[PDB]
Amino acid sequence: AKLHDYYKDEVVKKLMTEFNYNSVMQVPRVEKITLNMGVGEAIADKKLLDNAAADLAAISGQKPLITKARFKIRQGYPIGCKVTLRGERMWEFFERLITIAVPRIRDFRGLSAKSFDGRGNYSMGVREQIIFPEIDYDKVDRVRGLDITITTTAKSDEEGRALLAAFDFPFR
């Protein structure tokens, strides 16, 4: 909720005047943020998966959950663990990342507008996690990055563009 009040104060007015919605919640709003490094290299050994889980726990305020597969992978093989938030941690983590993580990107050519699901969600993988200062260089084992997929109530790609612009959408 660190940025929730600021969001409601600033994004809502501009989005309402540029769209002229009726209800307060008609503005697209993020519901969950997914952090899941698709390392896909723990097949040989699970130590890498343990290291990834530890990194997720350190970076995030919670502990990751280990999932299983739906490449030479069997059924029910645990390969990666994902992290998601729902609550104040949403805005806390988003504000932190947009303050320190997103601005500090090396060779930052910009986001990918086309990288949508076609229905109001954006998915992309940003490598060289060194952008996040929370990543301690002591415990880094390989060049990795977060496969962030923003989950938003946007009903179309136009709403996704508008809500990304609300966060100033640095550039393409």
**Residue-level length of the chain:** 172
Distance (Å, whole) CA 61 – CA 77: 26
Q: Contacting RNA (CB under 7 A), which of 13, 19, 40, 104?
A: 40
Q: Is 20 in the site for RNA (CB under 7 A)?
A: no
Distance (Å, whole) CA 94 – CA 99: 8
Q: Contacting RNA (CB under 7 A), which of 118, 137, 171, 172?
A: 118
Read off the tokens for 6: 């600021």
Residues 56-115 that bind RNA (CB under 7 A): 62-73, 77, 79-80, 82-89, 112, 114-115
Distance (Å, whole) CA 34 – CA 80: 13
Read off the tokens for 23: 């209800």
Residues that bind RNA (CB under 7 A): 1, 4, 22-26, 31-32, 34, 36-41, 43, 62-73, 77, 79-80, 82-89, 112, 114-119, 121, 123-125, 127, 144-145, 147, 149, 151
